[PDB]
Design a protein around this motif. Structure first.
Motif, PDB file in Angstrom:
ATOM      1  N   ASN A  84      32.046  36.307  58.498  1.00 18.81           N
ATOM      2  CA  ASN A  84      30.948  37.121  57.927  1.00 18.81           C
ATOM      3  C   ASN A  84      31.544  38.274  57.156  1.00 18.81           C
ATOM      4  OD1 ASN A  84      28.313  37.701  57.224  1.00 18.81           O
ATOM      5  ND2 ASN A  84      27.769  38.600  59.246  1.00 18.81           N
ATOM      6  N   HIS A  85      30.870  38.660  56.063  1.00 14.76           N
ATOM      7  CA  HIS A  85      31.417  39.638  55.103  1.00 14.76           C
ATOM      8  C   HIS A  85      30.218  40.041  54.290  1.00 14.76           C
ATOM      9  CE1 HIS A  85      33.635  40.927  51.347  1.00 14.76           C
ATOM     10  NE2 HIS A  85      34.426  41.440  52.281  1.00 14.76           N
ATOM     11  N   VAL A  86      30.226  41.229  53.708  1.00 15.56           N
ATOM     12  CA  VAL A  86      29.067  41.702  52.944  1.00 15.56           C
ATOM     13  C   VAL A  86      28.656  40.748  51.803  1.00 15.56           C
ATOM     14  CG1 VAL A  86      30.425  43.193  51.436  1.00 15.56           C
ATOM     15  CG2 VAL A  86      28.050  43.763  51.931  1.00 15.56           C
ATOM     16  N   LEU A  88      28.524  37.530  51.909  1.00 13.73           N
ATOM     17  CA  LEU A  88      27.931  36.296  52.464  1.00 13.73           C
ATOM     18  C   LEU A  88      26.575  36.553  53.041  1.00 13.73           C
ATOM     19  CD1 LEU A  88      31.133  35.096  54.354  1.00 13.73           C
ATOM     20  CD2 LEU A  88      30.198  34.222  52.160  1.00 13.73           C
TER      21      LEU A  88
HETATM   22 NA    NA Z   1      26.874  39.162  55.543  1.00 12.21          NA
END
Ligand code: NA
Lengths: 100, 9, 275
Positions: A84-86, A88
């Motif tokens: 998870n990452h900004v 996515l």
């Molecule tokens: Na995200």
């Protein structure tokens, strides 16, 4: 603000052979900013025994990290990496495919 | 080994 | 034959959750040898390669002192940059710095670099002459004026052309087994049908060091750049690297396609074929 998506690769250190100890790697690269959640999954469950490299970055400022655990492949066990990452909109799951 | 001379922006 | 030493620093602010996070790592070529993490318990510069472990207590004390000084400067920077850009405290921001020296086959100085980025974009960098600055926008011009008045470039140049090169040579000698090796790629291609009329051809390189490598596909000798999926070179975790490139081709055409591998460990570039 600049954001760049992680490129995720899940793979074993050595060619996989069932019943033979190995390492499972999830490498994430090319991302920005550096806040990222990365988990290795066994049969959909989070593996607790997981180490990672120290945060570093490439010539274009994008970050990279390696997450890894010792494992012994079998026929039935399915492995994956969840990230998870900004950039996515939902966590992304990439399954380990040993036949690439 | 690290440098010295690293100043604030 | 050519070598580099580089240090990479990242500081990230965290609005209302305390001090900024600070991480420093040092590499010789593609082998990491030190780290410092501001969030860790030790508060020490720590070894991350076997051959640096022999350095004595003065080295570790001095490197810890210096890395903490770097940490404090970047802490101040995050506040200064918010003022330069009229930014609020609602958000997290990122400073990165990287510096170091390259030497050629003969271990003589080639070039030096010292670069700074804010929120993922170039901010200011020393030019190749190590005597002047490239400032990427108007806020970085303010830093340029201040760093010119303080004669920062002269201090950096003395390090990059001298001290940096001397430590790199020392590390190359002490870590010679690890650092002055070259592991040529073990190569192969795989073939898998994706339907009754197409197949994926994937060209592999495994177990190589250093990481720099080129993998390309040709069709009847013509490069297939736009049709190739090339993944980022990735660590095996044992000190070697891996990489692959793939194309999806019409079944029956495999013999037109060749994979080409270039690496400093190979006495000649390899061409892999389906015939
Ligand atoms: Na995200």
């Amino acid at each position: 603000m600049i954001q760049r998506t992680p490129k995720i690769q899940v793979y074993s250190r050595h060619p996989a052979e069932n019943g033979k100890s190995n390492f499972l790697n999830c490498y994430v690269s090319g991302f920005h900013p550096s806040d990222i959640e990365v988990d290795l999954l066994k049969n959909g469950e989070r593996i607790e025994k997981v180490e990672h490299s120290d945060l570093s970055f490439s010539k274009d400022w994008s970050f990279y990290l390696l997450y890894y655990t010792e494992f012994t492949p079998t026929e039935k066990d399915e492995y994956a990496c969840r990230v998870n990452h900004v950039t996515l909109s939902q966590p992304k799951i990439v399954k380990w495919d040993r036949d690439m | 080994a690290l440098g010295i001379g690293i100043l604030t922006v | 034959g050519s070598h580099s030493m580089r240090y990479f620093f990242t500081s990230v602010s965290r609005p209302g959750r305390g001090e900024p996070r600070f991480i420093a790592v040092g590499y010789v070529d593609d082998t990491q040898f030190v780290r410092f993490d501001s969030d860790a318990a030790s508060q020490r510069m720590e070894p991350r390669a076997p051959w640096i472990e022999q350095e004595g207590p003065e080295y570790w004390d001095g490197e810890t002192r210096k890395v903490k000084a770097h940490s404090q400067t970047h802490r101040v920077d995050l506040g200064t940059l918010r003022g330069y850009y009229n930014q609020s405290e609602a958000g997290s921001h990122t400073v990165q710095r990287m510096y170091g020296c390259d030497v050629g086959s003969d271990w003589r100085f080639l070039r030096g670099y010292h670069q700074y980025a804010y929120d993922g974009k170039d901010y200011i960098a020393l030019k190749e002459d190590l005597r002047s600055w490239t400032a990427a926008d108007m806020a970085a011009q303010t830093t340029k004026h201040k760093w010119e008045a303080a004669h920062v470039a002269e201090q950096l140049r003395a390090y990059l052309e001298g001290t940096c090169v001397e430590w790199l040579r020392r590390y190359l000698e002490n870590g010679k087994e690890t650092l002055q090796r070259t592991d040529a790629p073990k190569t192969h291609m795989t073939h898998h049908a994706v339907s009754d009329h197409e197949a994926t051809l994937r060209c592999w390189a495994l177990s190589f060091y250093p990481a720099e490598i080129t993998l390309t596909w040709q069709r009847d000798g013509e490069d297939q750049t736009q049709d190739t999926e090339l993944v980022e070179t990735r660590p095996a975790g044992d000190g070697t690297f891996q990489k692959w490139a793939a194309v999806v081709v019409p079944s029956g055409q495999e013999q037109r396609y060749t994979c080409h591998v270039q690496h400093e460990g190979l006495p000649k570039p390899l061409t892999l074929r389906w015939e």
